[PDB]
Write a protein that binds this ligand. Structure first.
Ligand SMILES: O=C(O)c1ccccc1NC(=O)N1CCc2ccccc21
Length: 130
C-alpha cells in the first residue's frame, strides 16, 4: 500500500534514550545507535512482512493485522506483538513483563516516519525510499 517498499534510515531522534528506557545495555546501545537500517515492507494477502536489515543485526516479522504474535526483538526481548491499522497508521504494541512499548509507522510526504514510545521517551526514526 502506501507502506510497501525498500526504505533507508535518514534521520533519528532520541533512539539512545528509547533503547535506555527499554533496558538495553551500553554495548548494545552503542552498536545500535550508529546503525542505519533498511526496512523492507511487503504484503501478500492477509500477511504483511517487515524486514529490518543492518550490518550488525537483521530481523523479520510476518503478521496478520489484529492477530497477536510472539516476537524476539532486535535487542532480544521476548514479546507479544499486535499490529493494527488505525487511520492509515500501522500501530504495533509490544507487551512483555507487564511493560509495553508502541511503534507507529506512518507515511508522511515522501517519508516513512516511525514513532517509538516507552514511558516518557518518544523516538522518531525517519526513512526514505531506497
Ligand atoms: O530501527 C528502527 O527504526 C526500528 C524502529 C521500530 C522498531 C524496530 C526498529 N529496529 C529494528 O528492528 N532493528 C533491527 C535491527 C536493528 C539494528 C539496529 C537498529 C535497529 C534495528
Amino acid at each position: 500500500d502506501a507502506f510497501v517498499g525498500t526504505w533507508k534510515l535518514v534521520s533519528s531522534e532520541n533512539f539512545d534514550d528509547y533503547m535506555k528506557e527499554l533496558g538495553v545495555g551500553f554495548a548494545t546501545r552503542k552498536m545500535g545507535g550508529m546503525a542505519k537500517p533498511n526496512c523492507i515492507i511487503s504484503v501478500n494477502g492477509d500477511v504483511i512482512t517487515i524486514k529490518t536489515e543492518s550490518t550488525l543485526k537483521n530481523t523479520e516479522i510476518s503478521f496478520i493485522l489484529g492477530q497477536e504474535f510472539d516476537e524476539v526483538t532486535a535487542d532480544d526481548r521476548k514479546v507479544k506483538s499486535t499490529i493494527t491499522l488505525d487511520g492509515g497508521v500501522l500501530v504495533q504494541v509490544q507487551k512483555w513483563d507487564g511493560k509495553s512499548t508502541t511503534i507507529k509507522r506512518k507515511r508522511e510526504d515522501d517519508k516513512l516516519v516511525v514513532e517509538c514510545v516507552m514511558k516518557g521517551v518518544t523516538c522518531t526514526r525517519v526513512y526514505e525510499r531506497a
